[PDB]
Amino acid sequence: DPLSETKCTLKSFTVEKGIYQTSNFRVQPTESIVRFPNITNLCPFDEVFNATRFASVYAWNRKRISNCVADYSVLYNLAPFFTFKCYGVSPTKLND
Amino acid sequence: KNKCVNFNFNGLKGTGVLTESNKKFLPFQQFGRDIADTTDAVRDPQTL
Amino acid sequence: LPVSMTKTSVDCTMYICGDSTECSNLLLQYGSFCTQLKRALTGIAVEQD
Amino acid sequence: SKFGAISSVLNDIFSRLDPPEAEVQIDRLITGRLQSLQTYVTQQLIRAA
Numbered sequence: 001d002p003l004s005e006t007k008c009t010l011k012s013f014t015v016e017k018g019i020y021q022t023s024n025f026r027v028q029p030t031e032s033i034v035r036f037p038n039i040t041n042l043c044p045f046d047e048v049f050n051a052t053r054f055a056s057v058y059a060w061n062r063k064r065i066s067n068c069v070a071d072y073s074v075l076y077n078l079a080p081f082f083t084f085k086c087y088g089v090s091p092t093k094l095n096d
Numbered sequence: 097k098n099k100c101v102n103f104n105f106n107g108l109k110g111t112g113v114l115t116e117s118n119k120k121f122l123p124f125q126q127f128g129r130d131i132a133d134t135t136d137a138v139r140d141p142q143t144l
Numbered sequence: 145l146p147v148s149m150t151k152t153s154v155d156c157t158m159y160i161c162g163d164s165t166e167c168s169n170l171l172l173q174y175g176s177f178c179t180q181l182k183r184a185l186t187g188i189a190v191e192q193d
Numbered sequence: 194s195k196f197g198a199i200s201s202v203l204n205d206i207f208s209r210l211d212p213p214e215a216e217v218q219i220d221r222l223i224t225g226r227l228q229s230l231q232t233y234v235t236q237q238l239i240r241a242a
């Protein structure tokens with residue numbers, strides 16, 4: 001009850017006459033809403049990793065990936081792709 | 097709308113109430129910002 | 145001659161963490177800063193009156 | 194202000210990084226904001242005097 005909160009703040013079992021500031025009444029949220037773009041097509045990651053031939057390092061290849069939903073578990077679950085170190089973002093959060 | 101919910105817009109997480117706004121965004125803009133650079137208004141996906 | 149100035153109050157956790165709950169969980173590890181700030185601001189506020 | 198962190202928004206720090214370094218970034222932001230708030234309180238005390 002409000003009186004016990006005052007004792008707990010004052011660290012005393014007796015409270016003198018007066019007005020005491022105790023806490024804040026922040027209103028808790030009720031629902032949960034998520035909004036994402038309404039595309040459904042998968043991202044073309046297969047031809048980038050399963051490509052038969054890669055380019056030379058000096059003439060490195062570059063592919064533009066956009067307007068698609070990208071799931072990184074298809075990359076994640078394959079064992080042979082060992083060295084997966086990411087900069088500026090955790091590898092686990094890439095799916096979010 | 098008009099209720100205390102915790103939202104998620106394109107990975108922009110936060111808690112608050114969402115109301116109709118009359119901030120005339122330009123087509124290239126996506127969301128606004130307040131004095132302290134926290135997001136004030138946002139353009140929701142798949143509804144614009 | 146000025147006599148009194150504006151009485152102000154600061155919500156420590158709201159300012160320092162916003163709506164992030166785990167931020168408040170981390171903030172609890174820093175001791176009793178918010179208590180001292182609240183006490184000092186309350187002292188100034190009563191001093192104005 | 195970033196205070197040397199990757200962003201000034203707590204939610205981005207939490208949703209982008211693994212907690213072991215997210216806590217370092219949050220520590221940076223928390224200590225910077227707490228220092229600024231301390232500075233505010235001290236100047237308020239001097240003005241009150």
Ligand SMILES: *[C@@H]1O[C@H](CO)[C@@H](O)[C@H](O)[C@H]1NC(C)=O
Nearest residue numbers: 037038039040141142143144
């Ligand atoms: C997603 O659905 C909304 C609701 O009808 C629609 O306005 C929008 O155009 C859709 N997006 C796509 C990419 O089809």
